[PDB]
Amino acid sequence: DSDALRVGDYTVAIGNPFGLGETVTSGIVSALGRSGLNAENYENFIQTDAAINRGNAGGALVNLNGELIGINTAILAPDGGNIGIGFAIPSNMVKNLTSQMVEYGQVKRGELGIMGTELNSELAKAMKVDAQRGAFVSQVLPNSSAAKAGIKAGDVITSLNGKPISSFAALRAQVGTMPVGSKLTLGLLRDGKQVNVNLELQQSVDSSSIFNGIEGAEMSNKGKDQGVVVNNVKTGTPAAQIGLKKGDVIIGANQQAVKNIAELRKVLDSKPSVLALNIQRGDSTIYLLMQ
Amino acid sequence: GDVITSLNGKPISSFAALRAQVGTMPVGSKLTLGLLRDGKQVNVNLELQQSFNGIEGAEMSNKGKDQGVVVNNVKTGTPAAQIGLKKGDVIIGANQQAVKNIAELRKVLDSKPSVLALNIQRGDSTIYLLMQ
Amino acid sequence: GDVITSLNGKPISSFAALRAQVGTMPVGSKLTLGLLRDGKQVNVNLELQQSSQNQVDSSSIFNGIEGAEMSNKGKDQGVVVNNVKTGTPAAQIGLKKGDVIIGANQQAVKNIAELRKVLDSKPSVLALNIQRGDSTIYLLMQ
Amino acid sequence: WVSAAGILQI
Amino acid sequence: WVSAADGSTDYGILQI
Amino acid sequence: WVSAAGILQI
């Protein structure tokens, strides 16, 4: 259980550096809940001074009892050589992520539906809050699990399932690995009062998700099998470079009728050299060509 | 297409001169210009200009009776919209202090906090905006 | 979704060729096209019209100022600018798409003929009285 | 820097 | 030169 | 290349 890890605990790394072969190195837990290497990724890193280099990735980080505590992922090195700063993904996050892949082949990503940021000492002063660290709730989305739970903005999350929270970024990573419908409990702090709440993860689009490389255009289904309407378009993007504009409604592609995103994706699965979209702007019917 | 020929009676040597003249006059200075449009002499009275309460490039006012500080209209290029602020928002409070009007709002800003946390409300939702 | 195959009987090599063909024909020219829709041969009678947009380049009127297309606007409502290219002699003087030339050198301008009429005078400096949005401005040349 | 071997939403 | 102690030729457009 | 001596509109 990676949640029992404490800075100071001894760690042992096992991997294949430079293809030399199974190589074992040792160290200690430098720090926990490290993140920021890639703001878009779910990262709650364990940091260790245990030697890790090119090849160790996917390797095991274990404690003195040989139990897996994390998976060595990246290092901070200006020269491409270890300098005593390595990061590993906590065993718990792996436990959660793999168990899903085993069953679904992917991860059912759920959310609480809350906006927020890191609670620093400055922000604590303004909000008359005691804790100098945690998740500060900017706002709660309507019809979200959190809303239903009774979470209000200006709240500070301090714990998750009993385990204290290092930061907002950590909490994001925690729940970011849990399967949809997972029942969990949060420790909140509003007006210097401790609160406990029971939650349950819920379900939670861009054009890059369907064309694999075409960004700057959001789109979704239209009514009931009326095609794929484009919600919004950004300027200076790969999508608008082919003509695409917000308000268009994709009727079909390559002589195949398109009622929803599933049918559209089924034409792309065929992987044709050139894609011909039969969209409709206002009263007119037009075509858009790709490749 | 107009041609300015005088300033407060005194003839104009050039555009560069006119620029320097008024460029030294204080805001609100009322002056008179002599124009020439279509070969016709024209005279005009002017008053210099700058480039409720407004804070940080954001213009706001009071709402009803002590119902907070509602946002009337915002500028996009300004730092106001750079922190999220949109038109229609209603500041209920800031930094755990209740805001009924621009007077109570300013009374929090007089404290000069390192960070400013606004408790505004858009629609039937309650959000926060942070500064600094 | 139609495919044009012939022009006035003569087969079509490419879209680019067709474009060039008709691009040289005078307005109102009556021509016929050979279409192909649903594996079905179609014939149609056409007549070239007055292009509302992108009607005329600027180098054709200023003899040396490229990167800006413009045409007449509605009914003697001036010369509107259809499109402007970046890094061109035109935009170098300020000209931007959406502008509508009302007059030049204190002479009213209703259409391209009137405008060209002022240029025939060949003045040392040209002062265009265009209008962007609800504002009226001027653009100077030379 | 790092190498492989704003309000956020939760 | 001086030291501390297209369009009309006379100037680009300045703001007053 | 060539030297002197996208949906297009027709």
A71, A75, A188, best to mutate vs chain D, most D CBs in 10 Å: A75
F2 contact C CB<8A: no
Q: Which of A57, A80, A115 sits opposite D7 (nearest CB)?
A: A115
Q: Is A289 helix (H, G, I), strand (E, B) or coil?
A: strand
Q: Which amino acid type is present at position B116?
A: L
Asked if residues A90 and A70 have their Cβ atoms less than 8 Å apart, the reply is yes
Beta-carbon contacts of A47 under 8 Å, excluding residues fewer than 6 positions away, are: A29, A30, A31, A32, A34, A85, A86, A87
What is the distance in angstroms between the Cα of B19 and the nearest Cα belonging to chain E?
Answer: 5
Question: Which uninterrupted H or E stretch holds B20?
Answer: helix B15-24
Domain of residue C90, CATH code: 2.30.42.10
Nearest-5° Cα angle at B11, B7 to B15: 75
Contacts of E6 in chain C (CB under 8 A): 89, 92-93, 140-142
Please tell me what resolution, in angstroms, this structure has.
3.8
Asked if residues A104 and A76 have their Cβ atoms less than 8 Å apart, the reply is no
Fold of A112-203: Pdz3 Domain (2.30.42)
Asked if residues B95 and A128 have their Cβ atoms less than 8 Å apart, the reply is yes
Which experimental approach was used here? X-ray
**How deeply is A155 buried, as exposed, middle or buried, from its count of CB atoms within 10 A (0-12, 13-18, 19+)?**
buried
User: From the CB coordinates, do chains D and E have 3 or more pairs under 8 Å?
Assistant: no
Fold of B52-132: Pdz3 Domain (2.30.42)
Q: Which of D5, D6, D9 sits opposite A52 (nearest CB)?
A: D5
DSSP per residue over C3-49, as a string?
Answer: EEEEETTEEP--HHHHHHHHHHSPTT-EEEEEEESSS-EEEEEEE--
Q: Which amino acid type is present at position C120?
A: D
Q: Which of C2, D5, B8 is nearest to A81 (CA)?
A: D5
E16 contact B CB<8A: yes
A128 contact B CB<8A: yes
Fold of A205-290: Pdz3 Domain (2.30.42)
The residue range of the domain holding C138 is 56-142
Beta-carbon contacts of A222 under 8 Å, excluding residues fewer than 6 positions away, are: A228, A229, A249
Asked if residues A214 and A235 have their Cβ atoms less than 8 Å apart, the reply is no
What is the distance in angstroms between the Cα of A122 and the nearest Cα belonging to chain B?
Answer: 6
**How deeply is A25 buried, as exposed, middle or buried, from its count of CB atoms within 10 A (0-12, 13-18, 19+)?**
buried
